[PDB]
Design a protein around this ligand. Structure first.
Ligand SMILES: Nc1ncnc2c1ncn2[C@@H]1O[C@H](COP(=O)(O)OP(=O)(O)OP(=O)(O)O)[C@@H](O)[C@H]1O
Ligand SMILES: Nc1ncnc2c1ncn2[C@@H]1O[C@H](COP(=O)(O)OP(=O)(O)O)[C@@H](O)[C@H]1O
Ligand SMILES: [Mg+2]
Lengths: 548, 49
């Protein structure tokens, strides 16, 4: 204490930032990975206030920018998912050890450190060790050196607000926050059909035109990223979306409009010449349908415990049969309105939502065409409702897998919602208590899907209080192997199930499995055939008398 | 919502007692006393877990 300096030296923030930015400059004629970054900076940190905004897609676009320049690229993209609290340097050290000790990978390689949200007390020491001090050291082992010529990118979600401003930082924002001050599309996604075809129909739906003229000329129509963003923001319902929901909406609309185009209903309207006005009701009901699916919304349990909606809420479900050429209607009823139209209601009460949808000549056409409209599933037998399901799910020649499972209307709304959620591309996560039947529900779905084959389809993965991540990647990898085997030999798709998948610190790795389709940095195969379904316990406090 | 709870408890007791010769009628007694215990659990300010 007697050798104390009562001065506390300090420097301004722009001086430190200019110092680090000037000493991170990779020079010319070095053939580095930094030539695609901000004029050779070689270290970046991408952050945001909220998640789902496009950090990893920015990293991927920088990676493909480095693919484009410097031909015969063959560049690796090393991904190290840091996922545990009380952060360990030996994990990222052992992940980086077998990489740059071969001296044929001294070609420029983009490195991409991914720091998750559950790493509470180990961040600035690791950041200052890697980015400033340029070393990772083991006490009994080797020493890593950060090299001027390998580009590094360290994610962080948002104390740290003061600390993360030192490094050369590139920030990213939701589409609401880049439409007022600044394109915003990923240009390879706008050229993709999944964002083109729903735009191709919503462009003609916004200002009123008849959809009797055929679309999808397989090329991009003359549009802009900003006006497409304007359409997808005004047609989503929620007022502050991330980039996840807006992409979810677009893939959902792609899947339902592909199911509409796969039917002969447009061909029947062409050959009958009095069926039109149908597709306006189609796209309007799919806006309602997508508002039903992908639009949600104690002071520290407020983002968790506050459930905005439950199953005690009307979910009007519509589905298009693939092989067979009719439709179905589950969850809502149609009754005559006094203004000359037909409104939609939910059973057991009176609700007058979604007025003024469509006209009478379409009802004349579908009454002529004999579609199953306005049927209440309280008084149907077992074979009729299983036939309705096998028409709905596309299953041919149904065999009843279990008559002990009593199928109520909630137990078929959940079936339909779950199967289309893993059909179109949304991640499937279940918020439910212990007493609710989810394992039996997904077992019934898997047994109905496999029908009569004795192969293993449903694989339960139990997630307990001491589940390390390594067994989770091992189980997901062996689920991939049995998925390839099952689709190779039986043409059958499997279901991977995570039950009480909320207790571990590896819930970020659980998010890594299905939300982005990448395991341990390796991309999951979209053509493999695999559906990951996870379940979490709800967040609520005990009673105060219980604590007493 | 406990409308189907008496259905679920009766299905479990008829599936897991294996009552091929126990009683044709007392399985309803077992099912609704289990449902009465479940309703007494629900008609209380808290549960255990
Ligand atoms: N600017 C953008 N334009 C188009 N799509 C975008 C954009 N930004 C993100 N996306 C989409 O967002 C989805 C997921 O986003 P991404 O994985 O990049 O989020 P993130 O910021 O890494 O999330 P997290 O913090 O949760 O890990 C992808 O389907 C991607 O196409
Ligand atoms: N349709 C159904 N018919 C009969 N019982 C059901 C049905 N759905 C769920 N159950 C009941 O749910 C219980 C499952 O308990 P639990 O293990 O807590 O389920 P989960 O593993 O889904 O949380 C079983 O006793 C089963 O009888
Ligand atoms: Mg991330």
């Amino acid at each position: 204490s007697q050798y104390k300096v009562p001065l506390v030296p300090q420097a301004p923030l722009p001086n430190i930032q200019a110092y680090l930015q000037s000493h991170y400059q990779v020079p010319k004629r070095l053939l580095s990975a930094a030539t695609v970054f901000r004029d050779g900076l070689c270290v970046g940190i991408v952050t945001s206030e909220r998640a789902g905004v496009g950090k990893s897609l920015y990293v991927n676009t920088l990676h493909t920018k480095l693919k484009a320049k410097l031909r015969d690229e063959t560049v690796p993209l090393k991904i190290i998912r840091l996922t545990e609290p009380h952060l360990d340097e030996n994990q990222v050290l052992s992940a980086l050890l077998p990489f740059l000790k071969e001296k044929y990978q001294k070609m420029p390689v983009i490195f991409h450190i991914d720091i998750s949200t559950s790493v509470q007390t180990g961040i600035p020491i690791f950041l200052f060790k890697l980015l400033i001090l340029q070393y990772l050291m083991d006490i009994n082992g080797k020493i890593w050196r950060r090299s001027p010529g390998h580009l590094y990118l360290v994610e962080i979600p948002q104390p740290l607000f003061k600390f993360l401003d030192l490094f050369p930082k590139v920030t990213c924002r939701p589409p609401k926050e880049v439409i007022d001050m600044e394109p915003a599309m990923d240009p390879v996604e706008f050229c993709s059909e999944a964002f083109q075809r729903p735009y191709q129909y919503l462009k003609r739906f916004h200002q009123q035109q008849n959809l009797d003229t055929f679309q999808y000329e397989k090329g991009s129509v003359e549009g802009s990223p900003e006006e497409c963003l304007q359409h997808f923001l005004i047609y989503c319902g929620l007022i502050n979306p991330s980039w996840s929901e807006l992409r979810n909406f677009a893939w959902f609309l792609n899947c339902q409009l592909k199911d509409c185009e796969a039917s002969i209903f447009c061909k029947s309207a062409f050959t009958g010449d009095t069926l039109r006005g149908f597709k306006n009701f189609v796209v309007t009901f799919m806006i309602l349908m997508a508002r039903d699916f992908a639009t949600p919304t104690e002071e520290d349990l407020a983002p968790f415990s506050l459930r905005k909606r439950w199953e005690s809420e009307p979910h009007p479900y519509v589905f298009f049969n693939g092989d067979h050429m009719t439709m179905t209607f589950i969850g809502f009823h149609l009754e005559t309105n006094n203004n000359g139209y037909v409104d939609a209601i939910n059973p057991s009460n009176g609700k007058v939502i979604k007025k003024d949808v469509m006209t009478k000549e379409l009802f004349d056409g579908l009454r002529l065409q004999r579609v199953p409209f306005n049927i209440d599933f309280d008084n149907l037998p077992r074979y009729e409702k299983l036939e309705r399901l096998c028409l709905a799910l596309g299953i041919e020649w149904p065999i009843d897998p279990d008559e002990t499972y009593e199928l109520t209307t909630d137990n078929m709304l959940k079936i339909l919602a779950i199967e289309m959620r893993f059909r179109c591309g949304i991640p499937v996560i279940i918020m439910g208590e212990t007493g609710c039947g989810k394992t039996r529900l997904i077992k019934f779905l898997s047994d109905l899907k496999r029908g009569s084959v004795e192969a293993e389809t449903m694989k339960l993965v139990k997630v307990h209080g001491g589940t390390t991540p390594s067994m989770i990647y091992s189980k997901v990898k062996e689920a991939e192997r049995t998925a390839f085997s099952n689709k190779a030999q039986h043409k059958l798709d499997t279901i991977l199930f995570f039950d009480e998948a909320n207790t571990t610190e590896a819930v970020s790795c659980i998010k890594e499995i299905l939300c982005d389709r990448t395991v341990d940095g390796e991309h999951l195969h979209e053509d493999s055939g695999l559906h990951i379904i996870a379940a979490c316990n709800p967040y609520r406090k005990h009673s105060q008398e219980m604590i007493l | 919502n406990d409308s189907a709870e008496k259905l679920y408890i009766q299905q479990i007791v008829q599936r897991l007692v294996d009552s091929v010769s126990v009683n044709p009628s007392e399985t309803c007694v077992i099912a609704d006393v289990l449902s009465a215990s479940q309703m007494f659990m629900r008609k209380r300010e808290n549960e255990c877990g």
